[PDB]
Amino acid sequence: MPKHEFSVDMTCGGCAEAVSRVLNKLGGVKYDIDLPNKKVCIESEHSMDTLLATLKKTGKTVSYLGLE
Amino acid sequence: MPKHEFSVDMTCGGCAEAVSRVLNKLGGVKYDIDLPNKKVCIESEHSMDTLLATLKKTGKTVSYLGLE
Ligand SMILES: OC[C@H]1O[C@@](CO)(O[C@H]2O[C@H](CO)[C@@H](O)[C@H](O)[C@H]2O)[C@@H](O)[C@@H]1O
Ligand code: IUM
Numbered sequence: 001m002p003k004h005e006f007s008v009d010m011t012c013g014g015c016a017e018a019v020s021r022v023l024n025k026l027g028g029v030k031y032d033i034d035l036p037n038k039k040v041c042i043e044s045e046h047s048m049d050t051l052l053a054t055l056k057k058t059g060k061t062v063s064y065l066g067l068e
Numbered sequence: 069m070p071k072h073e074f075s076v077d078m079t080c081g082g083c084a085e086a087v088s089r090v091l092n093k094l095g096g097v098k099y100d101i102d103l104p105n106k107k108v109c110i111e112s113e114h115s116m117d118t119l120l121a122t123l124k125k126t127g128k129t130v131s132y133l134g135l136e
């Protein structure tokens with residue numbers, strides 16, 4: 001049950017909805033989205049590599065904020 | 069040379085920029101993105117399915133409008 005944190009440059013509610021859709025499509029994840037602070041937290045067994053690649057499918061700029 | 073027309077639910081400048089990035093990655097395309105009218109036109113040799121799948125993976129709501 002590793003807990004990862006990512007930076008995603010979402011600018012409106014529509015941006016947040018799209019992040020939700022790609023994560024729902026992958027499955028096996030428990031996530032939380034903080035729009036104002038451009039942050040996404042994900043608890044999952046999927047590798048960090050897979051989570052990073054999935055988020056990048058949105059076309060948004062993504063970086064890693066680490067574990068915890 | 070074929071010109072495909074799509075409807076894409078973009079709600080801010082960031083949404084439009086994200087669409088342009090996934091298309092740039094695919095390559096072999098010439099496009100025009102209209103934010104206020106929520107439309108994207110694409111001139112390319114890639115198949116209709118390849119283009120649709122590329123737009124769908126962004127997590128945004130997409131639908132095909134026509135071809136010429
Ligand atoms: O944000 C896109 C889109 O949302 C609308 C309602 O569909 O406006 C809402 O969201 C804005 C955030 O960017 C708020 O500032 C606004 O007050 C709220 O109604 C559209 O107006 C906008 O195009
Ligand atoms: O991008 U224009 O017409």
Ligand SMILES: [Hg+2]
Pocket residue numbers: 011012013014015078079080081082083
């Ligand atoms: Hg947006």
